[PDB]
Amino acid sequence: SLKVVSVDTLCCDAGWRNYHFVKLTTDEGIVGWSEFDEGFGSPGVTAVIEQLGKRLVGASVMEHERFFAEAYCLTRPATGGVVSEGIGAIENALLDAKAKTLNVPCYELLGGKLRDRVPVYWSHCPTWRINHPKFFGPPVTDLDGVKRTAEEARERQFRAIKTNIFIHDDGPLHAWRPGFAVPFQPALNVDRKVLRNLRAHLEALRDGAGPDVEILLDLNFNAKPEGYLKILRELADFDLFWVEIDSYSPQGLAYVRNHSPHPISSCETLFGIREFKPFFDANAVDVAIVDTIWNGVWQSMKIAAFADAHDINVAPHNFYGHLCTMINANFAAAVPNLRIMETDIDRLAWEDELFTHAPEYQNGELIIPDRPGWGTDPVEEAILAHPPKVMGGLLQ
Amino acid sequence: SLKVVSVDTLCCDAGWRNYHFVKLTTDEGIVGWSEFDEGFGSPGVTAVIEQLGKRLVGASVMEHERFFAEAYCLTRPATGGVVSEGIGAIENALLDAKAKTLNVPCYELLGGKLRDRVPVYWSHCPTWRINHPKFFGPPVTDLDGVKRTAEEARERQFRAIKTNIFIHDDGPLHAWRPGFAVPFQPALNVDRKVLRNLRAHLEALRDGAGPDVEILLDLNFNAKPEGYLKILRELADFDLFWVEIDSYSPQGLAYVRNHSPHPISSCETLFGIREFKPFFDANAVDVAIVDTIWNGVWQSMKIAAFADAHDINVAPHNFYGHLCTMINANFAAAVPNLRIMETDIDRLAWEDELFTHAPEYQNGELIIPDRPGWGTDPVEEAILAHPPKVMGGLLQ
Amino acid sequence: SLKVVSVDTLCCDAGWRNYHFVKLTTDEGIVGWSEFDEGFGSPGVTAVIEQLGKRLVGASVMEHERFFAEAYCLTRPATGGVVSEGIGAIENALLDAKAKTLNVPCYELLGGKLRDRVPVYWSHCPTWRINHPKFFGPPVTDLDGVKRTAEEARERQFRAIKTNIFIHDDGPLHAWRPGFAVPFQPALNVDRKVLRNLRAHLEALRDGAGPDVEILLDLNFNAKPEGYLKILRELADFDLFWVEIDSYSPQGLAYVRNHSPHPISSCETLFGIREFKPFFDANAVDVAIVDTIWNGVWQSMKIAAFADAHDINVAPHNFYGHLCTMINANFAAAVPNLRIMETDIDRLAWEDELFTHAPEYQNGELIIPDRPGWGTDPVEEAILAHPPKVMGGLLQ
Amino acid sequence: SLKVVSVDTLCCDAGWRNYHFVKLTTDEGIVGWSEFDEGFGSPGVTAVIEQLGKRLVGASVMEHERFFAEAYCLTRPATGGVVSEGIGAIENALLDAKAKTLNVPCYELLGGKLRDRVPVYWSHCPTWRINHPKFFGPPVTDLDGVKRTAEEARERQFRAIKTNIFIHDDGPLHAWRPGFAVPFQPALNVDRKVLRNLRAHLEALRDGAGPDVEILLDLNFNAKPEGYLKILRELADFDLFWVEIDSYSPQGLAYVRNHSPHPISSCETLFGIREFKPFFDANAVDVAIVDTIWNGVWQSMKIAAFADAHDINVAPHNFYGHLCTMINANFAAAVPNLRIMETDIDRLAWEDELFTHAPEYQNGELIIPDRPGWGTDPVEEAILAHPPKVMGGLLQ
C-alpha cells in the first residue's frame, strides 16, 4: 500500500548547532527525508512533529495537501512559528517520499524544472569564519582576513557574497547581533561605532572581491527603522546587490525601502501568503526571501506565485546542511521568478559524511540534480556517529 | 538573594485534556506559579519553557520585563504561537513570585485594583455537557437538555451564557467544529443544516434563559466570511450579547462586522499589540478577547491599553483550570476597559483537589481575592495523584 | 491604613522659572513626591491638582490607576493640556508613595529594570548659557563661546549635546523663538538670516565637539512645514543625531520627515496613546519624545509600549530639576525601546540644596539609583528658603 | 485711548455650579464682558485668564486676533482644554468691548446678521428637573413627570426638546452618567437595564411631546462605540432629531454613525479647525456642535466656515447663564449653516437678577437683540449678593 507507516525524527551535531531530520517510511519501504532546524529561535519543533506525525501514520503518502489542511485545522489557534515549522518539515518529507514513489526528482512534483543550474551567493562570508572559527577556517580575525576571504570567493568563481555586521576596533573582531541579544541592548540603537565599522568591513570586502563580484549585506533584526535608515545613508555610495532587513513592521520596512538607494530584501521568517501580504501591500521589498524549510516547499510554491503576481523575485533561505540545500535546489529549479540562491560554502569537516550526495557547483552555479526525491539522503550511521549537543544557535 | 534558582513544569489530567504549570523558585524560597495549555492547538510549549527557563536561572526574579526582552530577542525569528505561549507562561510565574516576594496580590503590580468583583459569563454552556459528558454532567443530549442548562444558569444568578455550534437533527447531538477538523471539511462551508440547527439550539437556550440573561455565541474558526455573514443574517432577529469569530483576515472580519446587527468579538488567539493592530485599524471588532495565559499578564496590560485608546473594551480568554481563572481575575481587577470575564462554571470532579483556593462567585460575579500572588496555588501532591494522558484538546 | 491623608503643592524659585511639587502623605506616614511645571505654556496646573487632590484624600494609595480612571472621567470634556498635567503630577506622587510603601525603587513598579545606566545627552547646550546667563555660566555671547561649550561637553565625556536656534550677526547673541512669541512673528517664516545663523552656530559647535560627539538640533514650534523643509535642506550636509520638530500637524510633520536626511523626533507635548497615534499612523517620526512628567510615568509606559509595536524608540522629555530627572531615570530604566535620555547638565547654584540626592553621571551615562521611590526627595526647608517668583518660563 | 486697562474675573452661585465672568475695561471706560465655566471638567480656567490678562493690559482693545495669536504662542505646548478656554473667555470679552466701542451688536463684527430669530431646543428637558430639583421645578421623579415636562414644552410652543439617560426602575429616578464617574463604572458598558430604561423614558417623553415636537437624545461620553451601537439598534424605531455622542475616536464615532438610522451630532468639547478635522475627514457627524464659550466666537466663525465647506450645519453649545445665551445668539445670527440653537429654558430663581437683560423667546425662537455688545451685562452688585460655592458641576 501507499500508507505512511512511521514518522521519526533524528538529530546530529553541526558544531555550534544541531541538524534535525524527519524520516518518513511508507508501507512500500520508501523513505522520505527532510531537514529542519531548532537553533534559529525555534525550540519545540521536534515536539510538534512528534504529535502531528502520530496523526499521519495510516494516511496516504500521496495526499500531502490533505495532511497540511488537517494539520492546519488541528493547530489553527497557534499557527505560525514553530507549529508551522513542524508542518513544513513533515510536508518536505512527504514530498520526498511521493517523488521517490513515482521515481522522479522533487522538481517534477513542482511544475517540472525550468532551469538546470541556479546562480548562488556564498552566504555568511566571512561571517562563519569570524563567529564559528572552531568549525570553519581559516579563522578571520581582522580586516586583512576579511579582504582575503573576499579574494577567495572571486578566485573560486562565486558571483556574489553576503556578510553581516562586525566590530573591528573594540578588541577582538566580533559580530554585532543585538536583535538576537548578542549583546543585550534591546533598543537596537545604531551608534557611530557601528556605522564606521560597517564601512571599514565593506571597504575591505570590496577590496578583496574586486569590482565584478556582488556584495550582499544582511542586517537581520539588528536595528529599528531609524537605525536601518542611518545605516543605508552611511552606505549610500556602496554598490550593494541587496540589503537584507527583517522586520515585523511592514509600514516601517516600506519607509526604509522608500529611502534606500539599494535593493531591499526581507521576509525569511514569514509563513504563508498571509504573512507576506502586508509587506507586498506596503511596497516594502525588492526581493522576498522565502524559507521553504520552514514553510514546506509546496506552501512555498504558493508564496512564490503570489510574489510573481507582484513582479517580485524570490530567494530561498538556505543556511543549514546539504539536504536543506537540495530541498531549496528543487524549489529554485521550478520557480520562474527566482532572484538567486543562498548557500553556505564554508562546510563542517563532517558535512559530507552525513549525506549520500554533496551539492555540486560549477562556475558559480548550483547544478540541479536529477535523482529521485530531493537529491540526497541523510546517512543514519553517520548521524549516530555525530551525537547532538544541547540546543545551540540563537539559544547558545 | 532574589535570584531565580529553578524553573520547572508539571502536568496533570484534566479529563479530555491536560493542565500544565510552571513552578519557579527563588533563592528566598518563594514559589511562583502559572498555568498554561498545549491542547488548544499548541504542542511544544513545554519544550519552549524548558529551554527558556535555563536562561532565567541566576537572574533576578524582580526583572520580568528584562526576561521578556531577552526571550523575545532569542526567539525573534519564530515569535508568536507556541514560542510566545512559553514566554507568557514564564512571565506569569515570575509575576506570582514577585508579588509574593513583595507580599501583595498580583493586581498590585498591575496598577492596583479598580474593582472588587467582575461580572462573568458561564462559558461553554451547554458545550461542555454535550461534548465532554464523561467529565461534566448532567449530560446534554437534546434540545430539552439545552433549555434546562439555560434554566440552571438563570436560577444560579448568572447574567450571561456562551454556547457554540451543534447539530441536533442528524442522529446524536454533536458539535460542529470543522475549523478544528471535527469533521474534516476544510472549506468550512455553512449549509442549510448548520443554519437551522443553530437557530433551533438558540431558541431552546433562550427559552431556558428567560429574557434577561444574555446569550453569547462563539463560532470560533468554523466558517469563511461568506458563511459568517450567512449565519448572522439567519440570526438577525436574535438578541445576542456578542458573536465571537476568530479570523486571520482583518479585512474579512471587518466586512462581516460591518454587516452584523450584533456586536462582534475576536482576537483570542492573537499575540501582542502588533497582531491586534490590523484588526483595530480595520474596525473589525466591538470587543477584543485577550488571552493573558498565552500572552502573559504584563504583555496583556499593554494590549488592553492599546484597545482602550481605540475605545474598545476587552475580555480575558479563560477556559482552563482555577489558576488560569485567578490569573485572569487579577487582570480583570486592574483593567478599566473590561467588557466582562469568561469562566467555565462546569468543573471537573477533582478540580478543587488540585488547587489551594477555589474562585468564589456571588450574584453572577467573581470576587477578586486579596492573597499574595494570583490567589491560588497548584497542589503538587494532588497533581501527582492525577497523572496526565497523552495530549488531548484539539489533538484528541 | 494605606489611605491618602493629604495632597499638597509646593513651589520654589528656579531663576527664570519656578519648580512645583506634589507632596502626598499616607496614613502610614509615607510621603510621595512629584515635580511638575507651569512655565512651559501651562498656567493652571496647580489649580487642577488642588481640585483633584481633594477627591483623592480617603482613597487607597495603592490604587493609582483607579484614581487616574476617575480623574479622567471627572475632567473628560477638557482632557489634555494642563488638566492632564495635573493628573500626571498626582500619578507620579502616588507612584513614589506606593514604591516607598513596598520599600522598592519606582522602576520595580514598572516591570523591573532592564539597564543599570542610561546614556544621556546634555540638553540646552549652549542654550541655557546664552538665554539665562544670570543663572548658568560661563555666559555664552558669541561663536567662540559656542565652540568652547561644545569642547567642555567632550572633555566631560558627554556623548551628545542639543542646541536650539540663535542669531549671531544682529547685535548681541539671542534665541530665535517665534513659536513662543520671542519675537512676535506669528507666521513663523524662516528667512535667509535664520538659515545662515543656524549654519554658523552648528559649524562652531561641531568645531568644539569633535567628530565623535553627537549633535542634536531642536527647532521646537519655530516654523511651518515649509520652513522646516528649508532648514533641513540648508543642513543637508551636517551630521545630526536628530532634528526635533514639534507640530500639531501629523500630515505636515510626515511630509517634512519624508524629505529629511536626518532622523526626526517630536511628540514632547502630546498626551496618551490617543495623541501619539496620528503621528505614528502618518510615519511622522524616527523618535517619539515622551513627557512622563506631564503624562505620568504609568501612562507613559502605555505610550512606550505603543511606540515599541511600531519599532519606534522613545526619549523622555527632561528639562526641569533633579526630581524630574530621577522620575525619568526610573522610566528609562524600565523601557526596552529607549533611544537616549535628555538631561540639563547646567545647574542652578542652589539645585543641590533643594533635593536630598543629586543624579550621578559616569562616562556620559546616568546611574539609575536603587533607593525606595524615585531616588530623591525635595527638601521642605530649602524650598522655603527659595521663595517663588511670579510665573516665568514662556510666560516671562 | 483704546488700550485695555484691566482684566478681571468674577464668580457667583449658580446652585449646583458657579458662573464665571471676565470683565475687561478700556481706557475709554468701556466694559466688555464674557461668561465662562469651570464645572464642566475644567478646573484652572480662572488661573489661565489671570496670567494671560496680565499680558493684555496696555494692548489695543481693537486687536483681538493679535491677542489670540500671541496667547496661542505663549501657551502652545499645552494648548487645548482649559488653556484654550481661558483664551476663548478673554476673546469674548474683547469682542464685547470692541462692539460697544463701535456702538454695534456683536453680530456686526461677525459678518452682520443674516437672521432676526433662531429656532431653539429646550435642552436638559427633563434632565434639570430630575438631577437638580432643588434649583429647577417642578421636580421630576417618575415617568408621568417625564411626560408632563414634555407636555409643558409643547404648550409653550417649543419645537424641540433634549433629554439624557435615566434609570426609572431601580429605586428613585436618577441619571446614568458613567462617562463622568456617576456611577464609577469606567468600562462604560451598556446593559439591558440601561436599554429598557432609555426606551421607557423616550416613550413617555414622546407621549407628552405629541407627534410634532422634535426629540433630541444626548448620550455624552457614556458608552464605547459598542454600546452606542446597541443603544441606536434598541432605538431604531424612534423618531429622533439627533443622537448626540461625544468621542475622542473619530474612527469609532464614524463607525457608529455609519450604522445609525438617526442623525448624529458631536464635537461640543473640541477646539479649533484642527480638532474638528479628523471627525469631518472620517464622516463622523451629521451636525457639529461648537462651543463658542470655550473656543471664543471669532475662532468659532472659522470652525463654522470649515463645517460649511463640508456641508455640515453647526449648533452652539449653550447650557450656562444668560450672557452665554446672548453670546451664542450673536454667533447664531451670523452663521449661515446653523442647525438650531441650544438653550436651557429651566432657570434659576435668581438668574434674571444677575443680568441687565433676559433672552426673549417667541413662538419657539430666540429673538436676536440689537443692543451694543452681546446684548446683556452681568450686574456686579447682584453677583456679590450670590457668592460662589466650591467648584461644582462634574467636580461635585
Ligand SMILES: O=C(O)CCC(=O)C(=O)O
Ligand atoms: O545570519 C543569521 O543569523 C542566519 C539567517 C540569515 O539571516 C540568512 O541566512 O540570511
Ligand SMILES: O=C(O)CCC(=O)C(=O)O
Ligand atoms: O471553544 C473552544 O474550542 C475553546 C476556546 C474558545 O473559543 C473560548 O473559550 O471562547
Ligand SMILES: O=C(O)CCC(=O)C(=O)O
Ligand atoms: O527648548 C525649550 O523651550 C524647552 C523644551 C524642549 O523643547 C526640550 O527640552 O527638548
Ligand SMILES: O=C(O)CCC(=O)C(=O)O
Ligand atoms: O449634559 C451635560 O452634562 C452638559 C453638556 C451637554 O452635553 C449639552 O449641553 O449638550
Ligand SMILES: [Cl-]
Ligand atoms: Cl538598549
Ligand SMILES: [Cl-]
Ligand atoms: Cl470541504
Ligand SMILES: [Cl-]
Ligand atoms: Cl509674522
Ligand SMILES: [Cl-]
Ligand atoms: Cl466598569
Ligand SMILES: [Mg+2]
Ligand atoms: Mg537573512
Ligand SMILES: [Mg+2]
Ligand atoms: Mg472563543
Ligand SMILES: [Mg+2]
Ligand atoms: Mg524639544
Ligand SMILES: [Mg+2]
Ligand atoms: Mg451634549
Ligand code: NA
Ligand atoms: Na516569524
Ligand code: NA
Ligand atoms: Na494565532
Ligand code: NA
Ligand atoms: Na499639546
Ligand code: NA
Ligand atoms: Na476636549
